[PDB]
Amino acid sequence: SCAIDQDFLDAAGILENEAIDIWNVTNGKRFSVYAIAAERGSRIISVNGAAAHCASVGDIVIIASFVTMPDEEARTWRPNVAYFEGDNEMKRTAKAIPVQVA
Amino acid sequence: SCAIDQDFLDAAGILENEAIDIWNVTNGKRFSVYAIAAERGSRIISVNGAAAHCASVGDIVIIASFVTMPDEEARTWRPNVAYFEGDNEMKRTAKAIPVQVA
Amino acid sequence: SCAIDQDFLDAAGILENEAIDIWNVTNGKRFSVYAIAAERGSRIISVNGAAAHCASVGDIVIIASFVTMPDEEARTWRPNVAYFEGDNEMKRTAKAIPVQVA
Amino acid sequence: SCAIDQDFLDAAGILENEAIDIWNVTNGKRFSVYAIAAERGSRIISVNGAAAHCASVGDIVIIASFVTMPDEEARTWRPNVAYFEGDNEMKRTAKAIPVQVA
Amino acid sequence: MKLTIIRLEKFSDQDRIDLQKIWPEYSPSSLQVDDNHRIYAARFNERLLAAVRVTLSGTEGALDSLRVREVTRRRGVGQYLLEEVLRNNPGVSCWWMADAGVEDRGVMTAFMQALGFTAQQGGWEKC
Amino acid sequence: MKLTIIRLEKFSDQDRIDLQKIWPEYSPSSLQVDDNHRIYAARFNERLLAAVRVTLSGTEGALDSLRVREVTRRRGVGQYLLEEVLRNNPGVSCWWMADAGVEDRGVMTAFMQALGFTAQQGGWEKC
Amino acid sequence: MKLTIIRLEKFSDQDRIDLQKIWPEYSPSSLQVDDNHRIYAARFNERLLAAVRVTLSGTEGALDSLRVREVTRRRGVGQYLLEEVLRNNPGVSCWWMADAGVEDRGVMTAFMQALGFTAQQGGWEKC
Amino acid sequence: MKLTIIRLEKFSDQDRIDLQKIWPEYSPSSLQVDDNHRIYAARFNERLLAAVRVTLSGTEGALDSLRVREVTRRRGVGQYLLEEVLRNNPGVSCWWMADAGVEDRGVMTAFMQALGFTAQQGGWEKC
Amino acid sequence: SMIRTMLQGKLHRVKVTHADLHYEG
Amino acid sequence: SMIRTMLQGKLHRVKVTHADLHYEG
Amino acid sequence: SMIRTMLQGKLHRVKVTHADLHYEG
Amino acid sequence: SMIRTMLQGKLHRVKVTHADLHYEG
Ligand SMILES: CC(=O)SCCNC(=O)CCNC(=O)[C@H](O)C(C)(C)COP(=O)(O)OP(=O)(O)OC[C@H]1O[C@@H](n2cnc3c(N)ncnc32)[C@H](O)[C@@H]1OP(=O)(O)O
Ligand SMILES: CC(=O)SCCNC(=O)CCNC(=O)[C@H](O)C(C)(C)COP(=O)(O)OP(=O)(O)OC[C@H]1O[C@@H](n2cnc3c(N)ncnc32)[C@H](O)[C@@H]1OP(=O)(O)O
Ligand SMILES: CC(=O)SCCNC(=O)CCNC(=O)[C@H](O)C(C)(C)COP(=O)(O)OP(=O)(O)OC[C@H]1O[C@@H](n2cnc3c(N)ncnc32)[C@H](O)[C@@H]1OP(=O)(O)O
Ligand SMILES: CC(=O)SCCNC(=O)CCNC(=O)[C@H](O)C(C)(C)COP(=O)(O)OP(=O)(O)OC[C@H]1O[C@@H](n2cnc3c(N)ncnc32)[C@H](O)[C@@H]1OP(=O)(O)O
Ligand SMILES: [Cl-]
Ligand SMILES: [Cl-]
Ligand SMILES: [Cl-]
Ligand SMILES: [Cl-]
Ligand SMILES: [Mg+2]
Ligand SMILES: [Mg+2]
Ligand SMILES: [Mg+2]
Ligand SMILES: [Mg+2]
């Protein structure tokens, strides 16, 4: 349902066959699918099958994966975040989102 | 809510009473329900009750089930995939989806 | 978000504060909320707060709860089903849904 | 996707990076995102990115988090509830919702 | 619709097809129904899953030909069928079922006992 | 709406019905309210869940007739009711509740103690 | 579309590009196809993932040049490719594959054996 | 927008407010910027979270006044800020930061070391 | 160690008695 | 102790044979 | 070994202060 | 024994390269 360049999967810690959520910044649709692999280096983000009703080529999306863990571990957990610009050029990876200030 | 030929449940490793997601290729709707059994050999896919607002007879859908497991197991996990054509004739079962190439 | 006669919670094995899904047979909307208790014997099904955008008085709904368990247990699991007619009169409880035949 | 005053996160027992559901009382939309922290005392509830298609400034929302636990623990579980009025002034915290009566 | 126990007085074409699958040994007509000779059936999603014949003689009643389709066994269909036959015939104080044609008597006894019947020579009683 | 503690000065038809369920022993009128003789109630989803009578004499105050509907006990309704009565009567430095009509004094003591009251002969005090 | 095994009789521009990636050592034309000299390929999402050459001589058939793109190995593509070549050539009772050009014979043997072929001197047979 | 490291050449009203919160000890103007005296800041969701002053002398550069808002510490803001200052000044082969005003030198050393700087008498170096 | 999500129970065809945006919720 | 949600299996492009609001459901 | 999904906590009737498509997110 | 659902990772503002109803899916 969504094929993703393997390098992007690794950066964000997403697995082939893992459930993922897609939030479409362009058209506001929010949908859940699973990841398949695309060829490393291809830069591909392919929205396939029934999911293609929910995005078009050129749409800017945010792709997330969620895990479960005990409360004690979740208090120190750090997510794997990867940031893109342009034609799917990876600009930065990080392990935390900053605090939004007034 | 969705009754499914028992042979199709077995092929995909879906259980009676298991939560399932339905993605409608025909009309783009995405909904979650649970599986009930239909008679083995009947080829039936029956969308029942409130779910029948979301599909019509003749619609082509994709039915999926999701499981949880520890990270280490998930890295080697292989899904149970079954592929249909025509009037619900099962053409192939498989344990992996290929890599999409450029 | 949904207050439910305590006798109905007990019949279906739903707990106060448990996540539940509501599928509206009348208007086709599907939403997820949590259960609160209503007074035993009141027959009440109250859709409250933001959820009241999704149902009206008189709508016929199906309310479900989902649990997780290991694969081996799930193969023998039997759900708690309760069936209503008229003004929320409980007609039957059961532990299985039959097989749909051709 | 949703930044929330740290004091509000603590009151409700929500963690930075925890999945949350948002139910919009104003416009009826229901969406799921994750929490990020906003500056303590800021009173901020910021709906960011693709989620901003689903709420506007001034909308009244209900933000919830869900956890899983064994059946035996869930029978005595008490949720962390915090109640607001006006410009995000916290009026009360509680550990139970009352029973709705006829 | 949900599982419902019906008394059959007239048969649709579909009822005829489904009853063939339940009772392949009967070819009805040959199924004469009247006030004392009744057929009860279990209906789910517009199909008959199970049926039983009931012969009423006032305070005595007899059951025969109880069968649930093999595809939908052990999901409570036979029990609800028999429960509802008893409840809708509150005048009957003594019920008898012969062990005639029963494919597996030991399963039938387990079932009948779950329903409050006592095993006797040649059948099961609730009186 | 969410649980809210209100001072009742006038009673709607609904308030009359709900107060019958809270205090079946009182038949009001007979519930005369004025500036020194107050009824506070806990309202949730347009119904009264609990109520208490308050008698003010300047820096002294008395509470009587505290009851939470049995259906909604142990969900913090009584505690919030008493908290808000104290907070909205900041002039009162000495509070007394008699053990009159209390169904279970040992539960009442546990409750009153959780609220900072001391058990005394014949009631509970916070002074 | 889902993984599909096709017999290639004509080549699109895309087929030419994909076959370069599968068989960089061949530069076709040089790929002459006709009724007895066939190319089968595995197609997924509008790209060729794998291909094999088949030489038919009635009840004898030979396979050469089997390759799956390295990016999509161990996902069942080679097995389905060979399965479908056998199934679509039911006249062939003896199949041979030479060990020519095989990069890793020990992986090839594991694969061929999974497909019911026997390792022989110089290749694998199913006859 | 996501965390971004910017060189500040002009200050908006908002930049002035945010820089007061970062550096309450400075009252700018007094912040003269030019080609060799630069301010880099970390911007997130339209606010400045952190800033540092940079003094360039060809192949030598000095850093001073590094501070991340206490509310958003230990989320990688300081590290990205310093990374990007180094990367955008590829002419500089020797960097120095004095231990002036540092609130906790032992945290600063841990940080600077994570960034490849060596603790020296009076500051940290990367040369 | 694979964990399944299963229907636990269901209330089939109850009717909504009250619906109010201002109730809690 | 991190637990992942994984595709278990899928029925790819089946066709709906029956759809009825009054069936159970 | 049946595991339930339970309300953990809730913020009841907060008001949105900011909504921006370009904020992170 | 309370288990939380946490963001694991995210791809922030990738652009869709292909969208096809007939691709697998
Ligand atoms: C022409 C003619 O028809 S002649 C008559 C021929 N009829 C036969 O030969 C009977 C064929 N068998 C059947 O039709 C069925 O197997 C029946 C009628 C015996 C039972 O019907 P079912 O719908 O499967 O039973 P149901 O699910 O309602 O069972 C209720 C209880 O019966 C008992 N029971 C039913 N089947 C079994 C079994 N195989 N083993 C042990 N106990 C059983 C159990 O206590 C069960 O309750 P539980 O599942 O809560 O444990
Ligand atoms: C005419 C007339 O009305 S005469 C007066 C008659 N009134 C009576 O007889 C009193 C009847 N009982 C009640 O109405 C209630 O049981 C009350 C007022 C005592 C308590 O009200 P509730 O809403 O149930 O109590 P609430 O949930 O606010 O309890 C707060 C704290 O009190 C204590 N408490 C309350 N009930 C109990 C109990 N049954 N056992 C032990 N402690 C208790 C606990 O510490 C509790 O805090 P926790 O739950 O965090 O442990
Ligand atoms: C010009 C020319 O082309 S000359 C020919 C050159 N060709 C070569 O050098 C072959 C290069 N290798 C390949 O192309 C592939 O690795 C192939 C053809 C051998 C196998 O293709 P794949 O699609 O990867 O195999 P597939 O996934 O269908 O494997 C099926 C079964 O084969 C066996 N198998 C495949 N690969 C391996 C392996 N690396 N180790 C052990 N067994 C294997 C396994 O039993 C496997 O089943 P399982 O995964 O259920 O365990
Ligand atoms: C006028 C004037 O401004 S004078 C200058 C005054 N400045 C000061 O007094 C400095 C005040 N402190 C700060 O501003 C910050 O605490 C800083 C700059 C030292 C670090 O900034 P932060 O954004 O919190 O650090 P960042 O999260 O990027 O940390 C990166 C690495 O540094 C190290 N580090 C940072 N903080 C700590 C800490 N408290 N303890 C140990 N190591 C730390 C760690 O290795 C960390 O990596 P990890 O989290 O992957 O373990
Ligand atoms: Cl989960
Ligand atoms: Cl789960
Ligand atoms: Cl779960
Ligand atoms: Cl979960
Ligand atoms: Mg049955
Ligand atoms: Mg209470
Ligand atoms: Mg393969
Ligand atoms: Mg930081």
DSSP chain C: -EEEEHHHHHHHTPPTTBEEEEEETTT--EEEEEEEEE-TTS--EEEEGGGGGS--TT-EEEEEEEEEEEHHHHTT---EEEEEETTTEEEEEES----B--
Alpha helices for chain B (secondary structure H) = 6-12, 71-74
Regarding the beta carbon of E112 and ligand 1, being less than 6 Å apart is answered: no
Question: How far is CA E103 from each of CA A10, E55, E99, E100, rounded to the nearest angstrom?
Answer: 60, 21, 9, 9
Q: How near does any CA of chain L get to the CA of K23, in Å?
A: 11
- Out of B40, B46, B48, name the one closest to residue E71 (CB): B40
CATH no. for residue B45? 2.40.40.20
Report CB contact under 8 Å: H49, A83.
no
Domain region containing E98: 1-127
Chains H and E touch (3+ CB pairs under 8 A): no
Q: How near does any CA of chain I get to the CA of F41, in Å?
A: 18
Listed in sequence order, the residues at least 6 apart from K16 whose beta carbon sits closer than 8 Å to its beta carbon are D45, D46, D47, D55, D56, D57, D58, D59, D60, D61
Nearest to E79 by CA among E36, E110, E121, E104: E110
Question: Contact D97/F2 with Cβ under 8 angstroms?
Answer: no
CA separation for the pair G116, G125 (Å, rounded): 9
Q: What is the resolution of this structure in A?
A: 1.6
CA separation for the pair C38, C16 (Å, rounded): 10
Q: Does the annotation count A1 as an active-site position?
A: yes
Token pair, residue E43, equals 């209906």
CA separation for the pair C102, E45 (Å, rounded): 10
| Structure-token match 């309450």, residue found | H24
Task: Report how many domains make up chain E.
Answer: 1
Report CB contact under 8 Å: D39, A66.
no
CB interface of J with E, residues 3-22, below 8 Å: 20, 22
Task: Report how many domains make up chain A.
Answer: 1
CATH no. for residue G3? 3.40.630.30
Question: How far is CA B71 from each of CA A13, C69, C71, J1, rounded to the nearest angstrom?
Answer: 11, 17, 17, 8
CA separation for the pair H4, K23 (Å, rounded): 12
Token pair, residue D25, equals 């009382």
Residues in I touching B18 (Cβ below 8 Å): 4-7
The chains found to touch L (3+ Cβ pairs under 8 angstroms) are: A, B, D, G, J, K
Q: Which element (helix H / strand E) includes H98? A: strand H94-98
Query: DSSP letters of F43-75?
Result: EETTEEEEEEEEEEETTEEEEEEEEE-GGGTTS
Question: How far is CA F101 from each of CA B83, F18, F25, F74, rounded to the nearest angstrom?
Answer: 73, 20, 11, 20
Helices vs. strands in chain B: H and E counts, helices first: 2, 7
CA separation for the pair H4, A92 (Å, rounded): 10
Question: Contact A43/A50 with Cβ under 8 angstroms?
Answer: no
Please report which ligand is nearest the Cα atom of H98: 4
Count of positions (residues) in chain C: 102
The CB density around residue G69, as the number of other CB atoms within 10 Å, is 20
Question: Contact C53/C8 with Cβ under 8 angstroms?
Answer: no
Residue F92, annotated ligand binder? no
Report CB contact under 8 Å: J3, B71.
yes
CA separation for the pair A18, B68 (Å, rounded): 10
Report CB contact under 8 Å: C94, E80.
yes
Burial of E104 (0-12, 13-18, 19+ CB in 10 A): exposed
Query: DSSP letters of chain K?
Result: --EEEEEEEEEEEEE--EEETTS--
Listed in sequence order, the residues at least 6 apart from C8 whose beta carbon sits closer than 8 Å to its beta carbon are C14, C45, C82, C88, C90, I11, I14
Q: How far is the CA of H72 from the centre of ligand 12 (A)?
A: 5
Token pair, residue J19, equals 């759809």
Q: How near does any CA of chain L get to the CA of G82, in Å?
A: 21
Count of positions (residues) in chain K: 25
CA separation for the pair H41, H39 (Å, rounded): 7
CA separation for the pair G68, G79 (Å, rounded): 10
Comparing alpha-carbon positions, the chain B residue that sits nearest to A41 is B102
Domain region containing C68: 1-102
Experimental method of this PDB entry? X-ray
Residue minimizing CA distance to atom 40 of ligand 2: F107
Q: Which element (helix H / strand E) includes B60? A: strand B60-70
Q: Which element (helix H / strand E) includes F82? A: helix F77-87
CA separation for the pair E99, A9 (Å, rounded): 65
CA separation for the pair F15, B48 (Å, rounded): 44
Question: How far is CA F88 from each of CA A4, C17, F84, G55, H57, rounded to the nearest angstrom?
Answer: 61, 31, 6, 96, 68
Query: DSSP letters of D16-81?
Result: TTBEEEEEETTT--EEEEEEEEE-TTS--EEEEGGGGGS--TT-EEEEEEEEEEEHHHHTT---EE
The CB density around residue E46, as the number of other CB atoms within 10 Å, is 14
| Structure-token match 């929320």, residue found | C88
